[PDB]
Amino acid sequence: MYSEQGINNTINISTTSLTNATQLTVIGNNNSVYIGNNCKIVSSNIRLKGNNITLFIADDVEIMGLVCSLHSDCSLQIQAKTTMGNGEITIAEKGKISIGKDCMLAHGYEIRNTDMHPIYSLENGERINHGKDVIIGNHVWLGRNVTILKGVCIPNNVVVGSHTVLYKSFKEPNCVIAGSPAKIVKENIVWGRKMYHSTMYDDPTLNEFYK
Amino acid sequence: MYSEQGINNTINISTTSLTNATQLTVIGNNNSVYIGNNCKIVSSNIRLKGNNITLFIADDVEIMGLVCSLHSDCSLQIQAKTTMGNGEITIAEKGKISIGKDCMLAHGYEIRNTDMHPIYSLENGERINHGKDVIIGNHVWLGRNVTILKGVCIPNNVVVGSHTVLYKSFKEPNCVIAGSPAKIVKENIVWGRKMYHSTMYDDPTLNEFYK
Amino acid sequence: MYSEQGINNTINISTTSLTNATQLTVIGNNNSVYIGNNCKIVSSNIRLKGNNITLFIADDVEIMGLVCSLHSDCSLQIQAKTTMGNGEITIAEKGKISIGKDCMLAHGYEIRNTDMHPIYSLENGERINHGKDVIIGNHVWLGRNVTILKGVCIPNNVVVGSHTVLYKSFKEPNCVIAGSPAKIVKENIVWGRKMYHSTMYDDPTLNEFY
Numbered sequence: 001m002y003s004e005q006g007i008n009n010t011i012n013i014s015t016t017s018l019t020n021a022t023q024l025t026v027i028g029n030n031n032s033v034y035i036g037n038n039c040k041i042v043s044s045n046i047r048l049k050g051n052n053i054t055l056f057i058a059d060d061v062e063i064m065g066l067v068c069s070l071h072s073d074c075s076l077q078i079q080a081k082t083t084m085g086n087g088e089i090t091i092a093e094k095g096k097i098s099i100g101k102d103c104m105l106a107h108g109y110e111i112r113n114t115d116m117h118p119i120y121s122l123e124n125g126e127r128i129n130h131g132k133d134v135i136i137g138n139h140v141w142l143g144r145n146v147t148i149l150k151g152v153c154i155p156n157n158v159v160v161g162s163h164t165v166l167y168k169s170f171k172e173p174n175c176v177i178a179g180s181p182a183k184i185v186k187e188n189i190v191w192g193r194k195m196y197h198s199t200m201y202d203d204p205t206l207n208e209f210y211k
Numbered sequence: 212m213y214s215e216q217g218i219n220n221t222i223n224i225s226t227t228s229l230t231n232a233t234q235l236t237v238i239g240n241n242n243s244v245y246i247g248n249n250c251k252i253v254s255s256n257i258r259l260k261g262n263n264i265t266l267f268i269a270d271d272v273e274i275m276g277l278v279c280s281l282h283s284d285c286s287l288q289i290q291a292k293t294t295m296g297n298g299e300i301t302i303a304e305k306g307k308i309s310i311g312k313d314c315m316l317a318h319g320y321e322i323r324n325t326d327m328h329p330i331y332s333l334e335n336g337e338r339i340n341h342g343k344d345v346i347i348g349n350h351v352w353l354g355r356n357v358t359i360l361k362g363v364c365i366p367n368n369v370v371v372g373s374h375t376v377l378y379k380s381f382k383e384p385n386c387v388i389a390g391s392p393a394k395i396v397k398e399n400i401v402w403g404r405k406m407y408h409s410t411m412y413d414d415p416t417l418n419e420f421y422k
Numbered sequence: 423m424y425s426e427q428g429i430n431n432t433i434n435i436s437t438t439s440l441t442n443a444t445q446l447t448v449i450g451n452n453n454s455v456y457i458g459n460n461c462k463i464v465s466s467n468i469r470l471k472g473n474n475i476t477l478f479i480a481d482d483v484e485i486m487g488l489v490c491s492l493h494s495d496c497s498l499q500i501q502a503k504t505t506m507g508n509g510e511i512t513i514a515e516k517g518k519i520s521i522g523k524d525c526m527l528a529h530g531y532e533i534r535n536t537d538m539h540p541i542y543s544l545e546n547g548e549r550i551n552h553g554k555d556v557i558i559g560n561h562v563w564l565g566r567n568v569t570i571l572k573g574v575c576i577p578n579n580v581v582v583g584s585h586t587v588l589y590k591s592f593k594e595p596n597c598v599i600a601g602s603p604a605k606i607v608k609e610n611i612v613w614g615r616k617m618y619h620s621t622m623y624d625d626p627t628l629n630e631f632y
């Protein structure tokens with residue numbers, strides 16, 4: 001079902017895209033939803049509740065089983081060619097999560113800019129766990145059941161190992177991050193989608209990563 | 212919903228509590244199940260197998276999608292105002308697990324006092340993993356997919372970070388616990404449920420924790 | 423029962439075995455499934471997609487809620503008396519996974535001989551993460567939500583702690599492995615199934631380990 005309530009809510013979804021079994025809900029005003037061409041956003045549950053919310057999903061994006069919650073003044077951006085399996089994305093506290101071009105997120109991803117509940121200093125009663133944006137660079141591959149906490153920024157051309165929890169940002173591109181505490185465990189690499197290729201040179205989508 | 216088999220089983224669920232979609236199975240005798248007032252115990256699967264088992268859920272408890280297995284002479288105690296998402300609790304070896312008041316347990320918790328199977332020392336043939344009680348103090352917030360194993364004691368007003376595993380007791384209240392191995396990672400704090408409270412002083416339920 | 427489709431597939435499931443609520447799908451050629459006596463393979467979903475794949479399950483194996491995916495020329499063998507709760511097994515790159523006798527695999531296991539996608543070194547463009555066989559020895563106990571990645575070999579009589587991820591093989595038998603990174607955390611032990619025993623000496627299945 002598609003469902004919309006409020007004023008100046010804009011919703012653009014190409015007729016060349018598939019939204020089978022997906023629920024989209026927009027409640028509030030000046031919210032915008034864009035889904036580009038040749039997308040498959042299936043069996044997903046997407047919920048925008050608040051004001052000035054922006055969901056932008058570029059062309060050739062495939063998402064299956066995404067559970068997504070966005071609150072007022074929040075935005076989610078997902079760039080072209082990115083693929084995503086079952087998972088969860090939560091944005092609150094007027095923040096932003098972005099996901100770069102040609103990412104590959106395996107089932108079980110949990111991504112959030114927020115803890116959803118405040119932690120205060122006993123010293124001065126002040127809140128000290130405020131939301132922080134999440135940026136996942138281009139060509140990032142998340143293995144199964146990876147969790148990305150607030151403020152985490154992930155460099156381009158990175159692979160995150162199965163069941164890793166990221167609570168801190170990294171700077172180094174072209175590497176594998178794994179373990180607990182999450183750490184760079186391999187450098188100078190590039191990942192691809194197709195195991196049938198002999199070398200990186202056989203995959204024309206990787207040219208920009210080795211030069 | 213409900214299904215019994217045995218005698219002198221005492222089951223009292225307040226008419227003011229909800230058990231929508233919940234299964235209660237009691238197989239055995241002299242068992243008592245107590246569910247207080249204004250409770251919401253939903254989409255759960257609770258079973259007691261054996262004798263003299265104690266399930267006590269105090270008032271103002273909300274539990275959704277709990278799978279719970281209780282064996283002979285075991286007791287589960289959940290104090291008032293506690294909320295719990297999806298998860299599992301397993302109790303055996305006629306042992307004990309209690310959960311304090313105003314706890315907030317996020318989806319994916321796993322809590323157990325037992326390994327369910329023996330491990331013995333080759334050195335002296337003795338068993339070395341006897342079950343041990345779990346004590347979760349007042350006002351504890353478990354992040355997602357937190358695992359709480361046998362004999363673990365958690366102090367009052369503690370936050371456990373997402374995907375942490377706890378195999379050991381902590382004694383310090385007012386702190387955040389995270390990482391592998393789990394350790395105090397922040398000190399002198401207090402958590403609340405509502406973000407829209409700027410400071411702890413704006414939260415009536417936090418009075419006690421600052422003195 | 424099962425949905426089989428292609429040329430010369432052989433499915434041999436002992437008449438003494440229960441397959442309640444299990445879906446077995448075979449699509450391809452020259453595939454072979456053997457399930458031995460007194461097995462209970464229930465609520466599982468076993469998919470063989472490709473050619474020359476083999477699945478071998480020995481006697482007295484009990485599996486509940488297994489989601490299994492085998493590709494061409496792959497092989498899964500599960501030895502006698504092994505029990506398995508809900509979990510996932512994935513095999514590709516023409517590799518194999520082998521699970522020993524009398525293992526105990528708790529709910530949430532994930533076992534794979536492949537990453538499903540290539541990683542290349544920038545120094546020469548060559549692939550560095552080829553799939554690698556997984557071998558779980560006899561009498562291995564996986565606790566809850568254990569993940570076993572490619573190439574991993576686990577020794578006999580090992581307990582893996584719950585929520586442990588294994589990315590590397592171990593060589594030492596009779597130990598508890600846990601934590602992150604995964605390490606030997608207790609040596610010189612043996613586990614059993616029934617906790618009603620003063621000592622190991624009261625469990626006859628355990629004699630062979632001392």
Ligand SMILES: CC(=O)SCCNC(=O)CCNC(=O)[C@@H](O)C(C)(C)COP(=O)(O)OP(=O)(O)OC[C@H]1O[C@@H](n2cnc3c(N)ncnc32)[C@H](O)[C@@H]1OP(=O)(O)O
Pocket residue numbers: 104105106107142143144159160161162163176177178179180185186536537538539541550551571587589590603604
């Ligand atoms: C959409 C889809 O189809 S994807 C879904 C299915 N696939 C997956 O989930 C991916 C599974 N793979 C993994 O999680 C990881 O192994 C991947 C691919 C990041 C890494 O693969 P590889 O490049 O072969 O890494 P390889 O195992 O060498 O590991 C590299 C190093 O990190 C170390 N390491 C790997 N994981 C960990 C860990 N969890 N903790 C500590 N160290 C680790 C290894 O010991 C190794 O160290 P060493 O070189 O000093 O000996």
Ligand SMILES: CC(=O)SCCNC(=O)CCNC(=O)[C@@H](O)C(C)(C)COP(=O)(O)OP(=O)(O)OC[C@H]1O[C@@H](n2cnc3c(N)ncnc32)[C@H](O)[C@@H]1OP(=O)(O)O
Pocket residue numbers: 114115116119128129130149165167168181315316317318353354355370371372373374387389390391396397
């Ligand atoms: C019931 C519900 O609705 S809950 C819904 C879902 N929400 C969640 O699961 C909450 C997610 N948050 C977390 O898991 C934790 O970070 C929290 C909330 C417990 C604590 O958050 P914060 O107070 O912001 O502290 P923060 O996460 O920055 O960590 C504090 C210190 O611990 C460190 N740390 C955090 N996680 C880890 C980790 N896994 N390993 C090692 N160190 C860690 C941080 O790096 C920081 O170190 P520093 O001394 O350099 O600052």
Ligand SMILES: CC(=O)SCCNC(=O)CCNC(=O)[C@@H](O)C(C)(C)COP(=O)(O)OP(=O)(O)OC[C@H]1O[C@@H](n2cnc3c(N)ncnc32)[C@H](O)[C@@H]1OP(=O)(O)O
Pocket residue numbers: 325326327328330339340341360376378379391392393507526527528529564565566581582583584585598599600601602607608
């Ligand atoms: C089919 C079925 O019925 S299975 C049912 C479900 N059961 C389970 O999932 C099993 C749950 N148990 C576990 O995951 C593990 O604790 C088991 C049993 C291997 C380990 O149990 P035990 O033998 O009692 O060992 P326990 O965890 O104390 O031992 C851990 C040791 O290494 C350390 N350790 C344990 N876990 C960790 C961890 N996650 N990270 C770091 N260190 C750890 C502990 O400190 C302890 O050593 P210490 O006392 O010197 O400090």
